[PDB]
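Design review, sub-item: ligand-bound model
Attendees: FS, YL, KQ
YL presented the inputs for the sodium ion complex:
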Amino acid sequence: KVYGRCELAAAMKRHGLDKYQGYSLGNWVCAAKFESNFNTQATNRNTDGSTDYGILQINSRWWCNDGRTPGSRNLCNIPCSALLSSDITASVNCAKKIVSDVHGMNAWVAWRNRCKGTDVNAWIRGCRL
Ligand code: NA
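KQ shared the predicted structure:
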């Protein structure tokens, strides 16, 4: 599924991400925009043999089990396929484990490059939340 901007914003809000670890809602929306273009089915194979899965492009070397990344960890305790669902629940629950402190969104490269220190409120402006 490809979410609309405001559609995702509302879902993220529902899921309790606003002000999670001090990060306003727009941060999460912006991350998703630049990581996956809001596509729940997005996957990207990395040169280390790991893969990034889903709307937040969560990686198999540490966070999920895809059965094909040798010597990796599974910190969210889920199969990576759970992260490709149309509903964002599994992805949000894993993202909450990833962001364990107030600097935790640095785990996402696209967030650091396109979101951090910008007007992230733009990503929810014009929506009904
Ligand atoms: Na893994």
